[PDB]
């Protein structure tokens, strides 16, 4: 099995590492690493980039997809706007989740809230051949 | 090849099992297993769960992704809000599809309508190693 | 490595083909093949199907996923409405990207603009077995 490296930045240190819940799980929940005293309200129609405080180190040949939580999508109409979000094996910046409120409630985002799921997947760079 | 188990519930009566159209197909189309003599109305901005009438039995090591139907996205602005929806090997509920109307017309959901596609894939759980420095 | 064939239609003449930025890139950017000195102005809440002028010949056992660019989603609220758009190995039509504007400002699509990314990956088909009796997936 490949190894996924995770660095917790300072604002993610008090939150758990991502992990698979069971041997059957497809993904790992990611949480909002906003400050405890800086909760936000995502208004209907609006979008916001939510920090996780994580840097991912994905080996060559793999990617991580950032997918929506189904519960939040159903209950509140919240989703990830750029889904599935593509984290490259090459990326060493912080992973951030772009949420959009496509419902009609004023949705509160708080530190520690589960906001998305990460799925680790193979990816290939094919030879690209122009043809007639 | 791995085997995907499918249970058809009673309200899926008369609807075929999902199947791949060809050896080249990446996904299987799912249909709306809603009551036969009713149209469900999905107004602009609204979302709703649509039953497929299927329980999937996905073997450990694999997942199913639920992806949008392109034709309904183009023609009516309809999509799957939580796309790509993740169904794991633990899940044994009925598969439901979360549609949202991001167009300007009343959209009518009818029995048998194709509403999404299912893509079956292996899933990998990498070893998670916390690191203090960029490698 | 497998080979992705790309046939260029007339309106993609003059444009760079899709290519990976680095050896670690998961996706390669797709460009709008609208006529030069033509524009698509996409108003808030509207969707439009943007031509790439490319046909992909993907070999069997693989698919291409059309996914959104993160920068357009963040900066403009633009996304791919049918994401991830599946292109299978049987598909020989022109690739067209279905953009929707979920932001507040107009979004102007111009020739050559990078409007999506394509991710190439293996795909499998399981055997399907009907059963009578008996996790992410529920709501």
UniProtKB/Swiss-Prot annotation, chain B:
* Keywords noted in UniProt: Hydrolase, Magnesium, Metal-binding, Nucleotide metabolism
From its record, what is one biological process in GO terms?
A: dUMP biosynthetic process
Please list the residues that bind substrate: 69-71, 82, 86-88, 96
Highest taxon of the lineage:
Bacteria
HAMAP family documented for this protein? dUTPase_bact
Q: What does the record give as the function of this protein? A: This enzyme is involved in nucleotide metabolism: it produces dUMP, the immediate precursor of thymidine nucleotides and it decreases the intracellular concentration of dUTP so that uracil cannot be incorporated into DNA.
Record's protein name? Deoxyuridine 5'-triphosphate nucleotidohydrolase
In its UniProt entry, the species of origin is given as Brucella abortus (strain 2308)
Q: Which gene encodes it?
A: dut
């Amino acid at each position: 099995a490949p190894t996924l490296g995770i660095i917790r930045l300072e604002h993610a240190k008090g939150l758990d590492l991502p992990a698979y819940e069971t041997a059957g799980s497809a993904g790992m929940d990611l949480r909002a690493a906003v400050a405890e005293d800086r909760q936000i309200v995502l208004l209907p129609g609006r979008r916001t980039l939510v920090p996780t405080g994580l840097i991912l180190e994905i080996p060559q040949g793999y990617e991580v997809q950032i997918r929506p939580r189904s519960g939040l999508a159903f209950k509140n109409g919240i989703t990830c706007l750029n889904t599935p979000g593509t984290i490259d094996s090459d990326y060493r910046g912080e992973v951030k989740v772009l949420l959009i409120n496509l419902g009609d409630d004023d949705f509160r985002i708080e530190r520690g809230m589960r906001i998305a799921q990460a799925v680790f997947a193979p990816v290939i760079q094919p030879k690209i051949e122009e043809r007639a």
